[PDB]
Symmetry: D2
Amino acid sequence: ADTIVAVELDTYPNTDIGDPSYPHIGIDIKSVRSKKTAKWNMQNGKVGTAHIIYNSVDKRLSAVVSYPNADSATVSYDVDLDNVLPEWVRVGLSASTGLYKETNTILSWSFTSKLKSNSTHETNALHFMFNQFSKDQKDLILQGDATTGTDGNLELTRVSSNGSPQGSSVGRALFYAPVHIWESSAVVASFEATFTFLIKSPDSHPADGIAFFISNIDSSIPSGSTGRLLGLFPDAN
Amino acid sequence: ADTIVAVELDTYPNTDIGDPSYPHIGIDIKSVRSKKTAKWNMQNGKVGTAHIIYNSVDKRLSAVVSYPNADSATVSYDVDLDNVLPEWVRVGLSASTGLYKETNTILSWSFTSKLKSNSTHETNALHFMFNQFSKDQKDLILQGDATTGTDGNLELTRVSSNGSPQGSSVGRALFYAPVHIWESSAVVASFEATFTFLIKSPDSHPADGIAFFISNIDSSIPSGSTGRLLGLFPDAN
Amino acid sequence: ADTIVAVELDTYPNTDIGDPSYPHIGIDIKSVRSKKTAKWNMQNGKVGTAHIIYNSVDKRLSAVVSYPNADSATVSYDVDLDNVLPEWVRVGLSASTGLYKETNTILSWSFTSKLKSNSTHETNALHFMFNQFSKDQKDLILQGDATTGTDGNLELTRVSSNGSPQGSSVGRALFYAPVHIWESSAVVASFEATFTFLIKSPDSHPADGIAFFISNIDSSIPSGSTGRLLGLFPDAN
Amino acid sequence: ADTIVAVELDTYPNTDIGDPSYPHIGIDIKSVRSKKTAKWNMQNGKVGTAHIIYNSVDKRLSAVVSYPNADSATVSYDVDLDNVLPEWVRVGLSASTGLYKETNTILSWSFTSKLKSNSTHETNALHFMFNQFSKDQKDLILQGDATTGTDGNLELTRVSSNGSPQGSSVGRALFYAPVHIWESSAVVASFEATFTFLIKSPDSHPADGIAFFISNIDSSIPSGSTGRLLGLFPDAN
Ligand SMILES: [Ca+2]
Ligand SMILES: [Ca+2]
Ligand SMILES: [Ca+2]
Ligand SMILES: [Ca+2]
Ligand SMILES: [Mn+2]
Ligand SMILES: [Mn+2]
Ligand SMILES: [Mn+2]
Ligand SMILES: [Mn+2]
């Protein structure tokens, strides 16, 4: 099985796998049963923004989510990612629906990783920024039901020709290049990610959510990971 | 009196003001008596690099210092800088000598500050990078004995025409623009700084050190702040 | 008198000073009588974006302006800016109204300048990005009628309490730090600027326009530079 | 056959394929017979830096090469790259030796590509920066004799265990992700690249050179492209 670290924007409360009884933001370390959660006042049909930050000095994975005109939600968890993830990873976005559903539309995604060595300075970095997505977006690896180019956006889960979200859908987008998150000479390693999203549903109960994740380079959607598993995990262990 | 937050590279142990009995890196919050220190294996005559990082989510000021071919030193301290510093600040480098002395030569200095609001994204930033310093470096405010342009470097303390460091010297360089570190709409604020330095002395006992600092916009060198006060503080309280 | 280089977004045709008979984008080198113009299909009440680029190898000042859903306009002019401007400059935005009027609202402004020397690499840079403007925006020098903070924007010219633009108005905003555009060791120097603007008028004939400019560090609004002079020039020579 | 655009640092004069009678920098558009050249005072055993710049407004490919303590060389050529290259490309470094030889050592490589659309702003970008290269550099596609990790560098051509360059060698390194250089909504597209290199030879006549190139995504070393063909072209047409 893959190795996954993720920040989830979890729209549906599954209380038997430890979700709180409300939409929430969570930090997931090798399990869908988040290590830490915070209440998230999710707004159906509004564009929101998520930010994720980490560095190897402090060893704290943190995230913040907001909408215009609204207060933010934040969550943090102390974890040494070099003890969880391999030295080379891929980074991605994932989303799912089940019997309950929503659009999982990404309007923008940026990421920056840096490795500073002890050689005079000495800086190594990767940065990408998407503010549109075209039909043939060659620097993304699309998995499952994910598509690019409809209204210039990344649709992680299936949307009907009329714009209605579909149930029982899972999809992911991974950046094409592998990312180097640990190196033996690094004195500080850091990453930051931001994405803007639009979660809409005809229903009072949207599901299931969107996640930013970091994985082994060869990660793939686990079998049966629709719905509450967010396209990330094979089971709810 | 000014308000100062600083990361010190303290080359001389002054044990009556709480220094450990060795060169050390420290976090200074409104006092020269560091809140946290770590041992620093300072190398006379070699070029080193310091990194300083902070964000308003985690509220942890951290620093790392290294040389080529050597292990690093690091220090961290939990502090909410919005409860210490004003909303607008200046950022700078400071150094001093006393009866013991050293060169306090800066070869490069970079800084990045970001304020992310809840408006769609919404990013505000300041970045500067110096890898040389000319004679008339109009975007630096020089204080005390600091000069620019000798061998293209920033000499924080006085150096004789022959290159020998002088005693009883203090000097600072502040970036010309004020820096916005808090704003009411910000959902995350962060800063990072890096500088490369060359501390050389003819003597077995160099003094006194170099600091990266953040201050009120109108900060000036306190009277009598040569030597152990690092050009930062009026007394050792 | 100041030394001015500017890219004008000129909303009102003043045919006796060489304007074409339509709104236009122009390159202004020490005169309001542009060296080069292109037709600009200005849209009253819509948010547009302008981009300005230059480097010292090619010695060509270029600009592009667009709106969403519309084609762009572009203009270029061959000019060695080191023969026009001093080594240190300030950069700014300017706008005016006369007997005809418009809002001259800036929603965002970014700028990047780089000087690459022959020392190993060796990079020097300044970057700033504003996506909001607060009431007390200490890193801007405001001149004339310019204000910050109304709806989070920079209003270059006066707007009544009800939002109606006023006539006979001029205002500018300059970045606080001086900018180094030439240095003796530089092997390549470049700059890029972007700003987003909203020009609205109740009238079929808006005036007078918005400009991005580069000037001597001590530049000030010339006497009598409302209307067709764009807050930039003392006369129409 | 591949489609190649390159900037060559050509160390050996092959006068029957149009080289000038001295080391030179050149712009190569689909042929090893440069469209434009300039004299290059190459220094055996010294670290140099090359810069390459282009944008779609001006349609001018320019390059500058220098050493510390020395004057620069520059070359430019007017060319619309959207009429030469496909919309998606890979970017790379190439080098070769023949019966004459040199080390073709890369110490650093950076690249930035940007696509600005007419949507509010709207920015898309890719940036990478290498200041070291490890043994298993997963974000580089190595071709031919290229290796990474010896002394932390990228060795494009073969070097014996003792550090002597070998003859009859060719090697390339391409960034792993495809790069988007044209898009239908872009109003400005640009790229910039920088690399630092060390060309050393025991011989009074080093050969053959180093190039930065842009190619179809599936580009490979052409058969027989050692020596004067620089790992780029199948023949000297
Ligand atoms: Ca759930
Ligand atoms: Ca001390
Ligand atoms: Ca006019
Ligand atoms: Ca040749
Ligand atoms: Mn959950
Ligand atoms: Mn101390
Ligand atoms: Mn005009
Ligand atoms: Mn040639």
